[PDB]
Amino acid sequence: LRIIWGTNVSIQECTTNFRNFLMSFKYFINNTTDEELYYIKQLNEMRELGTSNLNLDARNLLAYKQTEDLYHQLLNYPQEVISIMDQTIKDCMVSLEIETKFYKVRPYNVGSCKGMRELNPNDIDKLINLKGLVLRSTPVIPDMKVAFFKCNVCDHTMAVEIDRGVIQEPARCERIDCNEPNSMSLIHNRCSFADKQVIKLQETPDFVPDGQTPHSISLCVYDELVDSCRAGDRIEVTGTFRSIPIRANSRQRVLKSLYKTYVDVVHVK
Amino acid sequence: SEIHVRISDFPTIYSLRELRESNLSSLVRVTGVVTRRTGVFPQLKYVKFNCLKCGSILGPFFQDSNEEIRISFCTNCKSKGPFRVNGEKTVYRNYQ
Amino acid sequence: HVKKVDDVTGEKVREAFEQFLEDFSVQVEKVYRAQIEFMKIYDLNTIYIDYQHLSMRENGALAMAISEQYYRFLPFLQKGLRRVVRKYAPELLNTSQTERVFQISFFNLPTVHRIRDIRSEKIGSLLSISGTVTRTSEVRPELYKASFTCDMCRAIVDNVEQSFKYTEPTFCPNPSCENRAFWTLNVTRSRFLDWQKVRIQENANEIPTGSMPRTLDVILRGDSVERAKPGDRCKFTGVEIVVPDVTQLGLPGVKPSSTLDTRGISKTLGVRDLTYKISFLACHVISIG
Ligand SMILES: [Zn+2]
Numbered sequence: 001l002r003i004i005w006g007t008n009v010s011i012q013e014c015t016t017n018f019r020n021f022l023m024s025f026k027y028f029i030n031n032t033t034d035e036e037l038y039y040i041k042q043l044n045e046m047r048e049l050g051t052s053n054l055n056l057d058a059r060n061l062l063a064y065k066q067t068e069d070l071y072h073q074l075l076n077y078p079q080e081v082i083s084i085m086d087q088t089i090k091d092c093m094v095s096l097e098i099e100t101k102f103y104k105v106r107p108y109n110v111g112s113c114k115g116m117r118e119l120n121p122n123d124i125d126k127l128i129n130l131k132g133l134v135l136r137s138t139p140v141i142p143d144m145k146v147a148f149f150k151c152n153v154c155d156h157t158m159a160v161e162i163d164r165g166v167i168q169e170p171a172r173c174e175r176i177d178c179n180e181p182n183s184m185s186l187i188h189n190r191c192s193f194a195d196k197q198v199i200k201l202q203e204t205p206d207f208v209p210d211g212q213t214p215h216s217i218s219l220c221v222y223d224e225l226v227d228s229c230r231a232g233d234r235i236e237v238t239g240t241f242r243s244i245p246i247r248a249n250s251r252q253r254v255l256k257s258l259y260k261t262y263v264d265v266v267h268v269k
Numbered sequence: 270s271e272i273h274v275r276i277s278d279f280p281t282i283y284s285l286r287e288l289r290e291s292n293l294s295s296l297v298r299v300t301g302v303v304t305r306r307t308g309v310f311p312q313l314k315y316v317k318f319n320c321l322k323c324g325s326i327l328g329p330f331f332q333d334s335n336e337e338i339r340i341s342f343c344t345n346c347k348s349k350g351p352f353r354v355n356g357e358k359t360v361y362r363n364y365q
Numbered sequence: 366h367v368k369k370v371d372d373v374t375g376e377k378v379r380e381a382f383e384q385f386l387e388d389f390s391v392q393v394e395k396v397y398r399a400q401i402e403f404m405k406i407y408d409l410n411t412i413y414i415d416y417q418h419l420s421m422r423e424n425g426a427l428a429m430a431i432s433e434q435y436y437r438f439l440p441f442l443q444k445g446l447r448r449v450v451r452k453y454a455p456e457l458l459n460t461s462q463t464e465r466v467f468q469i470s471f472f473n474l475p476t477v478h479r480i481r482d483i484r485s486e487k488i489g490s491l492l493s494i495s496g497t498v499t500r501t502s503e504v505r506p507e508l509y510k511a512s513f514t515c516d517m518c519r520a521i522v523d524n525v526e527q528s529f530k531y532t533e534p535t536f537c538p539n540p541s542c543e544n545r546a547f548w549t550l551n552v553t554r555s556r557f558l559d560w561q562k563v564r565i566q567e568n569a570n571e572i573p574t575g576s577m578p579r580t581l582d583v584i585l586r587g588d589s590v591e592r593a594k595p596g597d598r599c600k601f602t603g604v605e606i607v608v609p610d611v612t613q614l615g616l617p618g619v620k621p622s623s624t625l626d627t628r629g630i631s632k633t634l635g636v637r638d639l640t641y642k643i644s645f646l647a648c649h650v651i652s653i654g
């Protein structure tokens with residue numbers, strides 16, 4: 001039972017726990033679709049249609065005796081649980097291009113909760129759902145993943161991968177012949193970028209404590225979910241709860257102790 | 270790391286009293302007697318400098334045997350600040 | 366003397382574009398070669414090529430590659446043009462003594478993209494967009510190839526490529542001087558281009574349900590300046606570029622950052638922000654409807 005530090009998760013435990021459920025699921029009940037092997041139709045039809053996203057309802061799992069544990073673990077450590085859940089799919093798919101295509105899950109039935117303003121700081125890095133009306137969205141913003149460096153004395157080109165936001169700029173040329181200090185230049189248009197958009201949502205909770213005026217929330221949608229929401233739309237959103245420190249002003253590298261809050265969206269209804 | 274050339278024969282042989290200012294910066298061959306000698310002192314050959322703001326070792330620089338060499342720019346921190354020779358990482362030459 | 370590394374595929378695409386220039390026939394003549402002579406009779410600087418001609422040669426290849434990696438291949442296509450002019454028009458290479466700046470213009474692409482469909486995986490490629498023009502600025506000179514003087518020694522370094530920013534030389538050419546940071550600019554003997562900025566807006570019929578129009582900044586160079594009036598519907602063909610943006614400091618999310626690697630440096634701090642916004646640089650402007 002290896003436990004990942006800071007969590008209660010065992011990767012092998014959860015992968016094996018998940019593949020049995022994915023290969024066998026149960027449930028005014030029919031005999032045509034309510035008593036058949038459910039999810040292998042969902043996977044087969046997915047691969048047949050040429051599709052990449054599996055949409056995974058949540059309360060499915062709070063009944064089946066094994067994966068009950070996994071429901072609590074998914075509502076507490078979304079980062080580590082969703083990487084376990086993908087390797088199950090691309091293993092399960094060949095078990096049934098499929099050696100170079102990436103799979104994703106999208107939980108959309110997380111419940112309970114009572115609004116953004118009732119959440120405490122102990123709910124950071126947790127999965128929550130929101131309902132509301134969209135007002136604004138900024139145009140697409142390019143986000144850098146792989147950078148491009150050129151040696152200005154030898155024309156040797158290097159590529160670097162972003163690691164948790166930080167880019168490591170080489171100090172010495174890598175060529176065994178041209179070994180110079182500080183010869184690396186950055187060419188912006190040769191780099192690889194990705195999509196980012198910011199939405200502003202007017203939250204419409206169910207419980208409104210005495211004297212709450214309406215407020216607005218910020219949501220970050222990446223890659224596929226771009227231009228998927230338009231102003232005036234009433235939507236339901238699943239995502240993670242984050243916090244970030246902001247810089248006091250542009251000139252100084254100083255930060256502010258009070259944090260800023262937002263939501264990383266995973267599913268949209 | 271380096272091979273030295275020494276010319277063996279050479280026609281014109283001078284005495285010390287014949288030399289004049291027309292002989293400056295030229296190849297000569299002379300005779301004489303050795304009257305004094307000094308000890309062996311080291312001379313700078315491949316010099317490494319320290320940047321006293323970012324603590325970096327700047328790479329090999331060559332000494333020409335004419336005038337002392339001094340640097341002015343740190344490539345990592347971009348400064349013209351104080352700079353001092355690293356005695357431990359330097360390579361020296363024999364002098365007498 | 367260090368050996369410069371070469372892009373093999375760059376050489377192959379240069380050779381292919383040279384064959385394209387020198388061996389195209391339409392019902393019969395060599396159209397581009399005719400235009401070449403046409404530019405000596407009136408002293409012009411721009412070459413207009415048709416994209417449908419690029420595709421047909423070598424079915425499924427030259428055109429696919431140039432469109433998808435234009436930012437890389439543009440200098441090589443410029444060099445090929447220079448070699449063709451050297452052959453069949455050597456007098457045109459000199460301004461009526463400096464060299465004459467050459468500009469290439471593609472048009473008549475298969476598809477026209479909407480402003481609200483631009484993504485970041487098309488950065489540095491060739492595309493055509495539509496919009497409505499609202500604001501134009503006056504024509505101003507732009508620094509293209511500059512001359513610098515050393516401050517330790519006084520040597521002259523000429524023809525430094527700027528590439529969208531104020532670049533300075535990174536090494537004195539004299540094998541003796543070791544200057545790499547201290548330079549001064551001779552504004553008298555530097556070469557400039559003409560520069561204008563245009564603002565565009567989304568067309569009325571292309572706006573989604575419940576949303577407001579979007580905008581984009583368009584950069585024009587050379588002979589393309591002063592072709593767009595306010596209140597026009599135009600189509601632009603050009604390259605999708607990125608420019609620094611300090612307004613993003615405050616938006617939620619992780620904002621990429623840069624730092625220097627201290628693993629490998631012998632010892633006994635320069636963080637820069639990677640925030641950009643999408644802009645557009647145009648080579649062909651046409652007013653339709
Ligand atoms: Zn190099």
Ligand SMILES: [Zn+2]
Nearest residue numbers: 320323343346
């Ligand atoms: Zn330093």
Ligand SMILES: [Zn+2]
Nearest residue numbers: 515518537542
């Ligand atoms: Zn110099």
